Each structure stands twice: as C-alpha cells, then as structure tokens.
Amino acid sequence: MHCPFCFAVDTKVIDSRLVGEGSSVRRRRQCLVCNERFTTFEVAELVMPRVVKSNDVREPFNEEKLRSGMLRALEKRPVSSDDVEMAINHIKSQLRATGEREVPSKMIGNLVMEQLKKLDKVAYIRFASVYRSFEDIKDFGEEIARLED
Amino acid sequence: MHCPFCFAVDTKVIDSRLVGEGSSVRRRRQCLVCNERFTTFEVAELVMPRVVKSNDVREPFNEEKLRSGMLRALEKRPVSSDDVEMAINHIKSQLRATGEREVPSKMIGNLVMEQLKKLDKVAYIRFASVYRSFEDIKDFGEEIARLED
Ligand SMILES: Nc1ncnc2c1ncn2[C@H]1C[C@H](O)[C@@H](COP(=O)(O)OP(=O)(O)OP(=O)(O)O)O1
Ligand SMILES: Nc1ncnc2c1ncn2[C@H]1C[C@H](O)[C@@H](COP(=O)(O)OP(=O)(O)OP(=O)(O)O)O1
Ligand SMILES: Nc1ncnc2c1ncn2[C@@H]1O[C@H](COP(=O)(O)OP(=O)(O)O)[C@@H](O)[C@H]1O
Ligand SMILES: Nc1ncnc2c1ncn2[C@@H]1O[C@H](COP(=O)(O)OP(=O)(O)O)[C@@H](O)[C@H]1O
Ligand SMILES: [Mg+2]
Ligand SMILES: [Mg+2]
Ligand SMILES: [Zn+2]
Ligand SMILES: [Zn+2]
C-alpha cells in the first residue's frame, strides 16, 4: 500500500498479530523511500449482515434462503415475480438500515411477514404456519382471527 | 431375437411400420436357418404410470415432485424421514394397483392428502391450502371445520 507520508506506492510488512481477538489483523509497515513506520488494521466488510440463526449459529446472509421461503408461501397466488423481487429488495434495505453487523433470523422472518401481509393474506397464513410453528389445527383459526383485527 | 420355430438366436428384420398409431412398432422378421417369417410388436413398458397434468399435458412420474410437495407441507412437523418414505412407497403402490398406463395428477394429490391426514393434521392443512388452492383467508377456517367431522 501507499506510504501515508512520502507516497511510495509500496511499503514492506514488519509484523502481523491478531489484535481484534480474531476479528482484526494488525500490521506494522515500513516505507522503503522515507524509512517511516505506520500501523494498519485489516477488518472484514460484510455486504449484508451475517444472520444469527435460532440455534445461535452465525451464517452469511443468503438471498436464496429468503426468496425460497416466500416463494413457497406464494404458491398459486396472484403475486408476480416482480412483486417478489420488489419485496426482497425492500427487506434487504431494511436489514441494512439497522446498521448492524449481525441480525437475528427472527428479524428476517418478521420482515417477510410484513411484506406478505401487504402482498397476499393467504401467503401470510402459509408462512406464519411454518414460521410461528403451528403445533395444532386450532392454531390456524386463531391466526386468521388475529388478522381480522 | 430367437426364432420362435427352429430357435436360431438371430433373425433378420424385413419391415418396420408404426401400426399402433405411434404407440407401437410392428416388425416382420425372417429366420436365416429355417427361412420362416413372423410378426413382432414393440411396445413401451412404464415403471410407473405417466401423469396427466391439470392442463392435460402428459409427463413421466416424478418421485421428487411427489416428495417435495409432502416435505414442504411437513416443515417443522414431528414426522421422521422414514415416515415420509413409508408414505411415498404406499402412494406408489396405490397408483400401480389401479393398473392404468396414465393417472390424473389430482389422483396423486388425493393420495398425498390421505397420507398427510394420517401423518400430521397441520401438514394436511398446509398441503390442502396449495392443492385445493385457497383463494381467501375464510377458506382456511372452513377446511379446519371440515377436518373435525
Ligand atoms: N411449505 C411452506 N409453506 C409456507 N411457508 C413456508 C414453507 N416452507 C417454508 N416456509 C417459510 C416459513 C419458514 O420459517 C421460512 C424459512 O424456512 P426454513 O426451512 O426455516 O428455511 P431458512 O431459509 O430459514 O433456511 P434453513 O434451512 O437454514 O433453516 O419459510
Ligand atoms: N408451500 C407449500 N406448503 C404446503 N404444501 C405445498 C407447498 N408448496 C407445494 N405444496 C403442495 C401442494 C401442491 O399441490 C403440491 C405440488 O406442488 P406443485 O408446485 O404443483 O408441484 P408438482 O409436483 O405438481 O410439480 P409442477 O411444478 O409440475 O406443478 O405440493
Ligand atoms: N442465512 C439466511 N439469509 C437470509 N434469510 C435467511 C437466512 N436464514 C434464514 N433466513 C430467513 O429468515 C426467516 C426466518 O427463518 P427461521 O426459519 O425462522 O430461522 P432459522 O433458519 O434461524 O431457524 C425466513 O424468511 C428464512 O428464509
Ligand atoms: N409428474 C409427477 N409425478 C409425481 N407426482 C406429481 C407429478 N406432477 C405432480 N405431482 C404431484 O401431484 C399432486 C397434485 O399436483 P397438482 O399441483 O395438483 O397438479 P399439477 O402438477 O397437474 O398442476 C402433488 O402431490 C404433486 O407433487
Ligand atoms: Mg430456517
Ligand atoms: Mg403441480
Ligand atoms: Zn514513505
Ligand atoms: Zn428359424
């Protein structure tokens, strides 16, 4: 990298330690031209926040996982492929607007529930049956009554 | 093929016409050893009946198409992978027991509905919502009331 003082396009690396407790790499660099030393930090930049799953396992944001769940609930429903992509881009925008490096998968689920509530109410019931995990048939009718309010 | 009269392991083909209106190939064969002639018919043997789709399109029986639909409805349900395979083999046995060369996809759907009715009643409602195509939220509660009888 460019020397921050003289501006030689290349500096030699002097040291490499894991100072951010694994999260970051600290390096020392020396300029060949002006013989000056400087510290650098190498940090990871995520395109989308990492997802914290129900079992506290961290995994990368998977657009396909998000899409498939919606498409399953929107089977035989009058929602175009554009409406789905339009809802996915808005959910992505909402997860970025939090500013968080990681987001609970429950948050992704609630965002999908709000898109489906606007898109199709049958698709909403289908997704809620697996998302909220209805363990009884009664649970189905109780979620329909919840939607009338 | 073997001559049906003398039993020479090979006979020469004399003619080839599409007599079964495409469904069958008729051939004439002459034996090299005894100089006798005989007619043969070549017919297609299906492992499982071909499926007539809702739009009258004929397509081969796809075990994966059958399985996926069940697995979608059985999401987060206490039905083991063995229970699913046990239900699929029984549905396959039932389609073969008809003796038909082709079966309506509606018949495959009703068979899955009866397996899910035995396996899990929440999975049954999930599959019925896409299979019977609920076009309204009311349709959901009306199918729950149908199950109580
Ligand atoms: N058959 C279905 N009908 C309606 N909605 C469904 C169906 N299957 C899944 N969904 C919805 C509700 C679920 O909470 C959501 C995500 O499904 P799930 O199988 O948990 O996938 P996922 O994207 O979370 O990946 P993972 O395999 O890592 O859990 O999709
Ligand atoms: N999300 C879902 N929840 C519950 N059951 C589902 C879900 N998606 C599909 N099913 C059930 C009901 C459907 O009638 C059945 C078959 O689904 P469908 O998409 O029509 O596939 P298929 O096997 O008929 O293939 P094809 O793509 O040729 O129509 O599976
Ligand atoms: N890695 C991921 N990236 C994007 N969406 C995800 C991811 N994992 C799960 N989802 C979505 O989060 C929502 C809720 O998932 P859920 O099944 O409740 O969580 P989990 O996978 O933690 O058990 C669904 O819309 C699902 O498709
Ligand atoms: N080619 C196939 N082979 C096996 N099962 C199939 C096939 N096509 C559809 N099915 C199954 O038939 C049932 C009803 O399908 P449905 O969606 O009602 O019909 P269609 O595909 O004709 O629109 C479901 O269990 C589905 O998975
Ligand atoms: Mg999941
Ligand atoms: Mg189908
Ligand atoms: Zn320098
Ligand atoms: Zn012969």
Numbering used by the authors:
A (entry chain A), B (entry chain A): 1 to 149
What does the study report here?
NrdR is a bacterial transcriptional repressor consisting of a zinc (Zn)‐ribbon domain followed by an ATP‐cone domain. NrdR binds specifically to two “NrdR boxes” upstream of ribonucleotide reductase operons, of which Escherichia coli has three: nrdHIEF, nrdDG and nrdAB, in the last of which we identified a new box. Our results, in combination with a previous structural and biochemical study, point to highly flexible EcoNrdR structures that, when loaded with the correct nucleotides, adapt to an optimal promoter‐binding conformation.
We present crystal structures of EcoNrdR–ATP–dATP and EcoNrdR–ADP–dATP, which are the first high‐resolution crystal structures of an NrdR. We show that E. coli NrdR (EcoNrdR) has similar binding strength to all three sites when loaded with ATP plus deoxyadenosine triphosphate (dATP) or equivalent diphosphate combinations. No other combination of adenine nucleotides promotes binding to DNA. The structures reveal considerable flexibility in relative orientation of ATP‐cones vs Zn‐ribbon domains.
